[PDB]
């Protein structure tokens, strides 16, 4: 190996998966570069369980201490775990970077980091190497954080001062932005990121410029290199589907007839809201495929599972990107996580938005009011009436025809971006010039 690149993951949520995907792409393009990937054991096992992991000659995965007591089980909240990891940082990474350098016999020449890990700037500077930051969400969420100062200083005013966020409501903003008093460790970290990010060699995103040209141009003026290289899913032969999702969708005759539902792997709405959603699915009589954990499935009305045995299918896990690409899928009821939205765009599937936390509210506002590739729910929850209305609008209405043309146009823009001469194709070659 001629080069050794250190890559530090934020070992929570869906931060580590998209960063590893980018390392896999860089590792493919740079066979003479060794990539050392630093992540928690818990996050690494999540990656192998979700099948994101693969075996490369030039990727080595290292465990970094997650700040939890060793030997005892960890029976704490996500909040506690995030606090413990941040308290253990960056010493946890420093220790393991040094052992990577001695065991490989090569000093790091470049440090790539989740943009949350603001201390990448310090770890890079100390070693005399470039710091590249990877933002795991959309440009719109990054812009909102970068304008934290201007936002706190003072609705219409905020819409008037963030280029491209004129449709955003105050309630939509990542609320870490307002955690300004006695901030939690996560809000301290994102505030320090906002201060250090402009000193990075490059900011990298799994997005494409054309989803938000005004935000993209604005953020290019804030950073040395602002590189949209996505979607990664469009720029890896699939296994076979042991869940039965694809075989079930294949038996659905009519194209764009199926409602796909997923609130991700962890969060579900209150039991009363799962009940209201189940009633809406019965009322509409659209075939549905729902990714829902077995604990949540047991809290559904007992009559619901019996009545919908021929209408729908409920599984604890779906191969989501393969589901969304199936020609029988007509709509995606989503929590509006950025990865889920981008997968939807990449397959041309319109959205019904039920956001929960973080960037999800802002993503849902962009879906309805900027991109216009889906709808939000009247009153923000999956009430029976709001859900029946949302499914009808998207699946079979004149408003649905408008949403269909908009998601097909965004789909087309995403494909052009990753094809030769595309913005993301060009930006990825720019990133290779930096890392080599
Ligand atoms: O049954 C499921 C549910 C989710 N996912 C994947 O889990 C990720 C969720 O990421 P997202 O950014 O949307 O959610 P967040 O992690 O931000 O809450 C996406 O890549 C999905 O494809 C999956 O493969 N199968």
Residue numbers in the entry: 4 to 157, 169 to 249, 253 to 453
What does the original paper state about this entry?
In plant biosynthesis, the formation of glycosidic bond is usually catalyzed by uridine diphosphate-dependent glycosyltransferases (UGTs). In this work, we report an efficient phenolic apiosyltransferase GuApiGT from G. uralensis, and dissect mechanisms for its sugar donor selectivity towards UDP-Api through crystal structure analysis, theoretical calculations, and mutagenesis. GuApiGT could efficiently and regio-selectively catalyze 2″-O-apiosylation of flavonoid glycosides, and showed strict sugar donor selectivity towards UDP-Api. This selectivity was highly related with the unique 45-amino acid PSPG box and the key RLGSDH sugar binding motif. Through theoretical calculations and rational design, we altered the sugar donor selectivity of GuApiGT and Sb3GT1.
To further prove the critical role of the RLGSDH motif in UDP-Api selectivity, we conducted site-directed mutagenesis of Sb3GT1. It shares 19.8% amino acid sequence identity with GuApiGT. We solved the complex crystal structure of Sb3GT1/UDP at 1.9 Å resolution, and the RMSD compared with GuApiGT is 2.64 Å. The RLGSDH motif in GuApiGT is mapped to FFGDQ of Sb3GT1. Based on structural analysis, we inserted a serine residue into the motif and constructed the 375S/Q377H mutant of Sb3GT1, as well as the F372R/Q376H and F372R/375S/Q377H mutants. All the three mutants could catalyze kaempferol into its 3-O-apioside, according to the characteristic [Y0-H]- ion at m/z 284 in LC/MS analysis.
